[PDB]
Amino acid sequence: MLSFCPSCNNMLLITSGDSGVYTLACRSCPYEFP
Amino acid sequence: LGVPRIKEIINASKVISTPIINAVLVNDNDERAARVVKGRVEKTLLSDVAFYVQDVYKDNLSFIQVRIDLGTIDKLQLELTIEDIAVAITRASKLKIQASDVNIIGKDRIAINVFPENDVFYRMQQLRRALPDVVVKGLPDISRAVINIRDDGKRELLVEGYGLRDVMCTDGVIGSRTTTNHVLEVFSVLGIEAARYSIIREINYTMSNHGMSVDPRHIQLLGDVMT
Amino acid sequence: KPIRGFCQRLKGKQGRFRGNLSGKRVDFSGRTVISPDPNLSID
Amino acid sequence: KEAAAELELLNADHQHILRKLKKMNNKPERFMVFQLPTRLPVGSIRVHKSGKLSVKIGNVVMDIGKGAETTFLQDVIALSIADDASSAELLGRVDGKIVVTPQI
Amino acid sequence: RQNRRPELGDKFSSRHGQKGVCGIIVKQEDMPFNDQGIVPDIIMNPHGFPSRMTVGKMIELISGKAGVLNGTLEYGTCFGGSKLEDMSKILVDQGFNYSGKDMLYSGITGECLQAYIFFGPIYYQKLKHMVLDKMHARARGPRAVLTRQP
Amino acid sequence: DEINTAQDKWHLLPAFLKVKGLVKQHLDSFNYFVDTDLKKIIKANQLILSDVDPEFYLKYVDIRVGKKSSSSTKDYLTPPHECRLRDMTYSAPIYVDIEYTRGRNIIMHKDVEIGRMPIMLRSNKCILYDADESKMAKLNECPLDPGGYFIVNGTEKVILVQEQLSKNRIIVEADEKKGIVQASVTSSTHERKSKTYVITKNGKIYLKHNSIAEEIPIAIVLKACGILSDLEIMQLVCGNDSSYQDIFAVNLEESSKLDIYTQQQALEYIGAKVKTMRRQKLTILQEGIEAIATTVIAHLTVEALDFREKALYIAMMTRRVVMAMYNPKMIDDRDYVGNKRLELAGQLISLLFEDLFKKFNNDFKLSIDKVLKKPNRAMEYDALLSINVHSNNITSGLNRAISTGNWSLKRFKMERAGVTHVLSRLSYISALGMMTRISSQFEKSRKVSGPRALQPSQFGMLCTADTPEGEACGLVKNLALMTHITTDDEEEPIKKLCYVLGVEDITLIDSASLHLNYGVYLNGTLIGSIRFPTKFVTQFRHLRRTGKVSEFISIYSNSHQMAVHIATDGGRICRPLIIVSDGQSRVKDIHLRKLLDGELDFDDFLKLGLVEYLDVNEENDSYIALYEKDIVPSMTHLEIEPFTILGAVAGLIPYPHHNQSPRNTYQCAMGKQAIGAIAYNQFKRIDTLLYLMTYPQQPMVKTKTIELIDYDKLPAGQNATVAVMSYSGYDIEDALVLNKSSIDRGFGRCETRRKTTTVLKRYAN
Amino acid sequence: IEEFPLKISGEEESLHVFQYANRPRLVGRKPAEHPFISAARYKPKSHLWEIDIPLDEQAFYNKDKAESEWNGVNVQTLKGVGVENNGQYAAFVKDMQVYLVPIERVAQLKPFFKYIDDANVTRKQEDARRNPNPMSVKSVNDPSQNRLTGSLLAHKVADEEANIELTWAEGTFEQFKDTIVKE
Amino acid sequence: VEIAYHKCDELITLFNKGELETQPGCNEEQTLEAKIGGLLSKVREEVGDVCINELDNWNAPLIMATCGSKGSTLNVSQMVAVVGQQIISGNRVPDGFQDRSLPHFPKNSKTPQSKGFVRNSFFSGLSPPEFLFHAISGREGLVDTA
Ligand SMILES: [Zn+2]
């Protein structure tokens, strides 16, 4: 869904965040976004 | 209607091809009521009634959001409430969800939330494609109902689907004059002597429009060797 | 290349039961061409 | 028909490539790559009557066609290596890319 | 080595695809004749040309008769060939009908025929599949060993 | 005789069949096998070696069929009609030259007899090549015989022109109850018989193969080839601003499930579930068994280091999967004539011979060291003494595979039978109409009447009116009168040629822009991604007509996708057509009158650029005009002669256009049965059953086709005097009535001859 | 009318071209910048290019996942294989002059994930440490047996060769005027 | 047959205008394909009606079709007037390659005399393009029996 992770263009992934927050962050790359 | 009509009549095979059912209405005019019952029987997919579906995030919410076009209910003359859609989500066993999590927000909006590894992203997206293909109103076994005109002012209802029991069970049709094809579902619904008279009426129909003429009696001997 | 057995000849298209028992070969027969003749009667 | 859509675009290619040839006269450490046809059987980029370019890179061998044609959303940078030593310097980035093709 | 003669049963053709069993062999004097004494070699019935739709044999007969009277062989090719309007001009100079359809007498009764007969030369190639080696007759003969049938 | 270019373009059709006859496809195939395609065999099976006594080597330097190097005369050969009266094979011996290690010194010995090759008639290795009715009268052989058929031990047989689907190319497929498949068979010439599938299970792309234990979804096998960044996948497959991103979007998240994300981790997921072939050593790295798993797959393209060009060939293979799921109208049929590869005799007898030849020198290898495992028998031992025991498996291998027409190969392990038939000497064109026919493969689609039917993409490629009926109704077909089967040349220089004309390369173009432009496809492989194709293709033909490139190419260029095609694979159909430049053709009747003078033949027409060969795929783009009175200022490729869409055995029908269409397929099945004359030597030959007619006559209404094969020089049947009418009722159901006096004068008195033979057998006692 | 003469003065320098498949050329019609290379890395006889790049800090970084998983921070390498071809000279343009130099290779830069490749190396190391459970003599090449070569042999030779840490500079006026003074 | 072309050739040209009559039966771009059939199935029969009444007695294919011995008023009409439009299993000769049937006809031209219809009689002759369209109806007449 246009989920490009810049500097790798790989993917994004809704990850289980702190206090249950719905953060999105991919593997194989140190990246995060609200 | 040729040899591949005689083949499955005498085989009495289960998966028949093109199993249209023939039903005659109650009234004679359209009056915006001859296709109000084709609305009551056609498998009304919700992608024809919805217009815009999207995922809305505040900070901590995982819910897909659905909106309907209320004017399309006015357009194709069908009749249904808004809450029976929210019934029809949890009446879908392929999307393995909890029974009662659904909440309306407004008049033309509806949203369902999900909650639990990595269940979060995957099953809000597997369900994003599996929500806009559910039946919300209509009979769950027919394919595509079509209204037509006969050589008189009376108009009937042609439905290209298997089920016949629930078609007799609906309103606006009369369950006295409703013929069909696929003989061996009449044997389930209408006993045994209706299956014997249906095999008769099928063989001598597909020999009337090929030109050859055998007899009535050579099919009446074939009907009784089966039943 | 597969070996014929007992069951591999009682069934099949004219192995038995169609080319041996139901439909046989008959003596006293003959097979030429046909040609028309008006000057003889029916039968 | 649709071949007349081609020649007018090739006219519109020359008027876009004489612009980028002329804005880069200020030698601002600017590079461009273009391909020459090898396997020879030096010259001069030159302007004809009413917007037309050609090169003649042999003694006689004329190459009429050129075209400023590709699309790249990439970063492209030229570097010179030498003998696998302390020889790493980025020369510059690349602005455009044209091609040369001989007429037949 | 043997040679033989075409008695009835021997299958002829027409080079356009009209098979035929030889049906009878009548004498010469029972065959019809034109004004000059030309007895036809072979008579075929009119009842093929509506169903078989072979207008080739109706043209091959016109382009053939006009070639005999002119002494020159003619071409029937595909998508071309010798035309019709330039071929009835030869066929009216020599004295015959413009459509090749001559008139002739009868050999049984003597008088003329109340219609006109389409008359001319057609190439009839002889086929294989003769009846000298298809007549079979088995009364009581050899029997196979595993089935004891004929 | 004021000649003009309106009705005298026919006069160059004899200029075609004079230099280049009607048995082109059989004679020019075996003649290429004997000359060149033997030397490419021994150069791939040279250097027979032993491991015991490692200073022994025997190498095959060169190979020849026919004459020696000592006498170097023509030959002395058993003549062909002398060879069919004795149940002998008509054959010529194979000669090789060798050097080998005798002992103290190596020794080079010439002209070693290893076998006897059978040679077909009217080839340039047999005695009937360019004779002049005086040498050929001495040999009592017919001048009008076609030639092209072996006389192995009596009976005379003919290898038939088989055809199959196009190897080394892909076809798209659709099915409702099964999903869709993507077959792509590839056969590189060394042991390789492999087909790959790109299947869709419930909305997901995969890739299965019959050496992988399971299937693999394609997002693995593109990160395995370097395309890893997972935006580059969708950027290659889908494009932009489309619904193709939505159908393909399921396969992206299966990288997140398997958690691979990188090109190093991408490989070992393949070879974890590869079916391991028994290597007998198994040095398996768990790093190189997957790097070769991207070498034994899709054997079109091989790699050196980058794995790159193999990747976006898989991406183009899976783009036409997604487009087929978007609408099933984009699919292709495997019955279109562009997807058929005709293959001749001499390029099929070479698949047999190198099976026999490697079976020769690995029985001859183990016969050496059975002697070389001796202490005394290692000094004076010579190897050519025991060569003749193994020579008999070449001759008896070739003669058994021609008589009983089933070829038992080893390299492909495949058992085609029915590949030879005995030719029928019923009539003259019954034995010439067999030499130009096609025997299909019957790929077991017996339910479907699609391939049983006839395609409109067949006009003048091969004949339309000759096809049998009954059990074989649409799978047996016949070449037309104007037809040439191409030959493959080379793909290295034309790939170097297309770079010069202004194409870019595959290793530089961005993947956002390869769908915006077109793409050159070389044998189905994208290499260059040309822009503005119509200046590129029209400058290509001007190299072809003027003659820089060979003429057997096709520049098919469709527009359903954004691609232009090249094809140089050989073994496909074509016919010649004269180039029309603009609203005036290139007919130039001063060239055509100079043809009749006899110095400007048909071959010099294509040397100048007045005529060229078009196949069925290059007829996609062209707009052939029927007649010179129909030229439009947008009209190319005037049709050279319109009755050439009928072969030499349908051609004898007079006025075929007036006649009905099923009454032309009823005559080709019976023209091969009409008795008549056979050859000039017909009272000399002893055949099994030979029908003759006493007094035949040439027909009255001839055809141009019957004078281009010399049919009327020995005709079949005679012209009666038909008086069409009903008579005596014995002519009702297309029976007919003839008179007794004409039969006694000799109307249709046939004659039947029948061989029978015995053999006086010599016993054990 | 007008004509611009070009001449070819370039030798002795095998200069390469890269292609960033990650960073775009222009951002909202505005031309972008190239990121600053920390150091370069080149492998002869296999032509690789492990260009290192830094990615920006905590704000868009999420070090708490980067530290605890692979313990490798602030370094994103990207592998490029040197691919060669003919044609394609490199041209810098003078006022009414244009001077060419041949390009030796063109390498394509793909994001090489280095750290999670190596995160499974200690994971593979710890496999046999929790499960410890336990002679090099010559043989003879046999002429009925084959050995690995071609594609997979080139990967056996491309992992073990000499590292070179390139002194990355940005000069190039020395390369300019040396070409200008030569005709 | 040219006044049947003149109604037909304008009826194809309403693709830029986009007229769609939408009969009951879910047409979806076949109204300009189904109307052409009965438009050509009227000129095929009405010219077959002209040739019967304007035809003298003692005509030979007339006097064995006034009986029931052999023939029809269809089979004689193809011999003197027109052989009509060939069908291929309920389809009027679909395209061969690249939205056309044969290289002698231009791209995506949906006219009759290009797909199926052949206007000239067996007595007149057949042209090299329209000869092949008769050799496909003549092919399915023998395949269908098997
Ligand atoms: Zn990332």
From Swiss-Prot, chain C:
It is found in: Nucleus. The gene is RPO31. This is DNA-directed RNA polymerase III subunit RPC1. The chain holds residues 348 to 390 of 1460 of the full protein. Present with 6020 molecules/cell in log phase SD medium. Component of the RNA polymerase III (Pol III) complex consisting of 17 subunits. The lineage of its organism: Eukaryota, Fungi, Dikarya, Ascomycota, Saccharomycotina. Belongs to the RNA polymerase beta' chain family. DNA-dependent RNA polymerase catalyzes the transcription of DNA into RNA using the four ribonucleoside triphosphates as substrates. Largest and catalytic core component of RNA polymerase III which synthesizes small RNAs, such as 5S rRNA and tRNAs. Forms the polymerase active center together with the second largest subunit. A single-stranded DNA template strand of the promoter is positioned within the central active site cleft of Pol III. It comes from the Eukaryota.
Swiss-Prot record, chain D:
Transmembrane segments: none annotated. GO terms for molecular function: DNA binding. One of its GO terms (biological process) is transcription by RNA polymerase III. Keywords: DNA-directed RNA polymerase, Nucleus, Phosphoprotein, Transcription. The keyword Transcription applies. It comes from the Eukaryota. Its main location: nucleus. It is found in: Nucleus. One of its GO terms (cellular component) is nucleus. Belongs to the eukaryotic RPC4/POLR3D RNA polymerase subunit family. DNA-dependent RNA polymerase catalyzes the transcription of DNA into RNA using the four ribonucleoside triphosphates as substrates. Specific peripheric component of RNA polymerase III which synthesizes small RNAs, such as 5S rRNA and tRNAs. Essential for tRNA synthesis. The RPC53/RPC4-RPC37/RPC5 subcomplex is required for terminator recognition and reinitiation. Present with 998 molecules/cell in log phase SD medium. Component of the RNA polymerase III (Pol III) complex consisting of 17 subunits. Interacts with RPC37/RPC5. RPC53/RPC4, RPC37/RPC5 and RPC11/RPC10 probably form a Pol III subcomplex. This is DNA-directed RNA polymerase III subunit RPC4. It comes from Saccharomyces cerevisiae (strain ATCC 204508 / S288c). The lineage of its organism: Eukaryota, Fungi, Dikarya, Ascomycota, Saccharomycotina.
UniProtKB/Swiss-Prot annotation, chain F:
Keywords: DNA-directed RNA polymerase, Metal-binding, Nucleotidyltransferase, Nucleus, Transcription, Transferase, Zinc, Zinc-finger. GO terms for biological process: termination of RNA polymerase III transcription; transcription by RNA polymerase III; transcription initiation at RNA polymerase III promoter; tRNA transcription by RNA polymerase III. One of its GO terms (molecular function) is ribonucleoside binding. Its EC number is 2.7.7.6. Present with 1950 molecules/cell in log phase SD medium. DNA-dependent RNA polymerase catalyzes the transcription of DNA into RNA using the four ribonucleoside triphosphates as substrates. Second largest core component of RNA polymerase III which synthesizes small RNAs, such as 5S rRNA and tRNAs. Proposed to contribute to the polymerase catalytic activity and forms the polymerase active center together with the largest subunit. Pol III is composed of mobile elements and RPC2 is part of the core element with the central large cleft and probably a clamp element that moves to open and close the cleft. This is DNA-directed RNA polymerase III subunit RPC2. The gene is RET1.
Curated annotation (Swiss-Prot), chain G:
The keyword Transcription applies. One of its GO terms (biological process) is tRNA transcription by RNA polymerase III. The keyword Phosphoprotein applies. It is found in: Nucleus. It comes from the Eukaryota. GO terms for cellular component: nucleus; RNA polymerase III complex. Keywords: DNA-directed RNA polymerase, Nucleus, Phosphoprotein, Transcription. Present with 1590 molecules/cell in log phase SD medium. Component of the RNA polymerase III (Pol III) complex consisting of 17 subunits. Interacts with RPC53/RPC4. RPC53/RPC4, RPC37/RPC5 and RPC11/RPC10 probably form a Pol III subcomplex. DNA-dependent RNA polymerase catalyzes the transcription of DNA into RNA using the four ribonucleoside triphosphates as substrates. Specific peripheric component of RNA polymerase III which synthesizes small RNAs, such as 5S rRNA and tRNAs. The RPC53/RPC4-RPC37/RPC5 subcomplex is required for terminator recognition and reinitiation. This is DNA-directed RNA polymerase III subunit RPC5. It comes from Saccharomyces cerevisiae (strain ATCC 204508 / S288c) (Baker's yeast). The gene is RPC37.
